[PDB]
Structure 1
């Protein structure tokens, strides 16, 4: 009951749901999409979520497939003002003899430069609402002008409730098992798939991409589990050194982050901010800013970073 595009070869594009029942939507979202398909007519919808891979384009194409709509797929960045005046009006004004509903799927239409192009679309809907319906998939909802959100039914993806999170994680684990049994990949440890789903949630496309990346040899053993669950590049070693006041560990690690100073500092501040007392928050931000301001003045950047580690480990009081 899985949908396979034999033409595609990217794993995250090969197994793309062709219907709403196949998706991993939350209970409320799946119920409302099923209701929309059962009603037979798609209203103006805006499927939006800052997290990529939640299912917006999949849901748009699946709706236009379920209701047998006369879908016209548009790259949103190509929906400039001439596109609204040109192909879009030609599409909406043409006659649908088959009775198929005309639906215009404007995928990834959150570009700001297309502000004017959206106004016309908002005017466009006021003149061709009966002829055609508009589905706008977007990531940054602030990029779609407010009148378009007022006219359209906005549906936010990628913020499921805790029960919905559990259910969709279970569904995604099941779907990844089906994908593995369909791709000729033997699953040695069943916890590896759960780890893949949990780490990359709610990005399902990244989940399938990581499944393809880690299934190089066709076996997902405890080594794959160690690779997935253990995130290289994190500051867990530095964080545990700071909490332990580990002088030797901080001294050894200081040259490891010497080259990538700015990003490491930003990540370090972002991570520590949530794990310290408010007064410790003020103090830590003060030290981080003061050290980062003298980044281009101090001679030894490695010793500079060691100084940063010393100060952070010293003046901090974990909650």
Structure 2
């Protein structure tokens, strides 16, 4: 039911799905993939999603596995113009004495510096389409030229509906539970698995990585739940001091965060954005932009951050 590759020790690489049915996809995407595998022949496909770890490479290999195709997996970054002139032509023109459809998987082909090669590939597709098909995967769809996008079926991963998201998260919870059972990880509180799934969605690779990381002591109990539901870089003290207009605590907190000024200012803007009025958003971004613009200009940096704190505490209207 689950696919285990004993050669791999990394958890996300050990449990890579091998069939289209095993992958956790949106309903319509899985339906189209099942249709592709059922009709027997694979068209030219481009699986793309900027969000990593949604299942593009997995689904490409699973299509090749369901069709039982003669797959040539290729690192897209190595698919330069000489690769198309050479290995791709050698593989397309080779005679097949077993009826297996030839499919070329070009994994992560979204490099701009390969545009010329991609153009060649397009011409290639007009000469060897009757011999083989191509399954490109990519993160930046704009890294694929427009003729390639037009000639292929472009499937956008990581763009689900709300009900699709609910169903996918339930399926991922079940899959992580099965992985725990296979790995000897005792689940004392399923809320840990639910929190991991909801936190790292839609990056399933990162979800299994988080599972491996937090399942160190072999038990998923309330302690691991409190560790997962936490934020190790949370700024809450500064936010609560600003909400209370506490000048003493802001004065005390200025040197704590004054060391990493740029990162702290970015995270503070990011956190205040969701907790204030729209006009407060305008004012906060103006204040923060000015204070950061005069970063290297001011003399006392801790004083500069305390000045930013006073400004924000005075002008913010917390919802």
TM-score, length of structure 1 as denominator length: 0.96
Structure 1 distance, partners of 2:256, 2:166, is: 38
Structure 1 distance, partners of 2:35, 2:246, is: 58
Q: CA RMSD in A?
A: 1.3
Classify the secondary structure of the residue corresponding to 2:72. strand
Q: Which range moves more in the overlay, 40-49 or 299-308? A: 299-308
Q: Counterparts in 2 of 1:1-319, with a 5 A limit?
A: 1-319=1-319
Q: CA deviation at 1:174?
A: 0.4
Q: Which range moves more in the overlay, 171-180 or 88-97? A: 88-97
Structure 2 distance, partners of 1:246, 1:51, is: 40
Q: Which range moves more in the overlay, 259-268 or 307-316? A: 259-268
Structure 1 distance, partners of 2:138, 2:282, is: 37
Structure 1 distance, partners of 2:111, 2:234, is: 32
Residues 61 and 249 (structure 1 numbering): CA distance in 2 closer, same or farther, change over 3 Å? farther
- Deviation by residue 1:130-175 (Cα, 9 ceiling, x = unmatched): 1111111111111111111111111111121110111110000000
Residues 278 and 102 (structure 1 numbering): CA distance in 2 closer, same or farther, change over 3 Å? same
Structure 2 distance, partners of 1:250, 1:146, is: 53
Aligned residues: 319
- Deviation by residue 1:21-45 (Cα, 9 ceiling, x = unmatched): 1011011111111111001111111
Classify the secondary structure of the residue corresponding to 1:20. coil
- Deviation by residue 1:251-296 (Cα, 9 ceiling, x = unmatched): 3332222222112222322333344333323322221121112111
Structure 2 distance, partners of 1:98, 1:253, is: 71
Q: CA deviation at 1:247?
A: 2.6
Q: CA deviation at 1:245?
A: 2.1
Q: Which range moves more in the overlay, 173-182 or 123-132? A: 123-132
Classify the secondary structure of the residue corresponding to 1:3. coil
Q: Which range moves more in the overlay, 290-299 or 97-106? A: 290-299
Classify the secondary structure of the residue corresponding to 1:165. helix
Structure 2 distance, partners of 1:31, 1:10, is: 30
Structure 2 distance, partners of 1:33, 1:249, is: 57
Gaps of 5+ in 1: none
Q: CA deviation at 1:318?
A: 3.1
Classify the secondary structure of the residue corresponding to 1:71. strand
Structure 2 distance, partners of 1:236, 1:154, is: 43
Residues 239 and 159 (structure 1 numbering): CA distance in 2 closer, same or farther, change over 3 Å? farther
Q: Which range moves more in the overlay, 192-201 or 232-241? A: 232-241
Structure 1 distance, partners of 2:123, 2:178, is: 45
Structure 2 distance, partners of 1:297, 1:173, is: 51
Residues 128 and 298 (structure 1 numbering): CA distance in 2 closer, same or farther, change over 3 Å? same
Classify the secondary structure of the residue corresponding to 1:114. helix
